[PDB]
Each structure stands twice: as structure tokens, then as C-alpha cells.
């Protein structure tokens, strides 16, 4: 896998 950060500001 591509082991990568992402931002989650979901509600």
C-alpha cells in the first residue's frame, strides 16, 4: 500500500 497521511474534518 501507499502508507500516507490525510486530513479528516468530516462530521
Amino acid at each position: 500500500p501507499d502508507r500516507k497521511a490525510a486530513v479528516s474534518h468530516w462530521q
Partner: nanobody
Amino acid sequence: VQLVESGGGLVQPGGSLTLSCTASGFTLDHYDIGWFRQAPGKEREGVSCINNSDDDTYYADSVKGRFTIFMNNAKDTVYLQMNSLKPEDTAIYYCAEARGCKRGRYEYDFWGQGTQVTVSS
């Protein structure tokens, strides 16, 4: 679980797409699964997440209303319905396991190459 994406394309603004996130036909109802995207010049962001055990769904403010994340009765696919697409929605879209649908900045295992969505007139 090794998930991958399908359903991209180039659509005109105002159109729609349905993306699919699958793991070889295995059922997904145990997992929490996020849909993410990485647009040109932008940080990779989570746009929608489903907690399948608890029946919760989460949306980024930029997509709420327009996007929905769901399974159907087969439970083999996490769909992303994307309505009223705008140029700003152009990105590679990725899916991954997102335990708890946590907010913040975590690392994910992106097993798929993503699916390109281009919204262009």
C-alpha cells in the same frame, strides 16, 4: 482488507458519478471505510466515511448534501454517490480502511491507485 477504487471519468460541471470501493468481492460490513481525494495543489483529504458496525456516516463540509456514502444489500462495495460535481471536485479519489472514522491527520494504507475524476467544461 485491500480495497481499490473504480468509477472515475471526466464529466461536465453539474454532472454526477458513482464511485465504488471493493475488496475482491469480499463483504465489507465489518469495516469502517473512508473515501478520500487528492486534488492538485491540495492536501489529501477525507470526504466521506462510513462506520458500518455502528451505522454512522461522516462528510466533509465541502461535499455534504451532494455526496453520500453507502452500501447496498450485497455489502461488497462502499459506494460514493457524487452529485452536482464542480471543477473544485477534480482529484484522484482513493478509499481505505478508516477505523472509527476519526477526525484529524492519520496515516492510511491506500492499496489502490485511485480513480481520476475530472470535472471540466
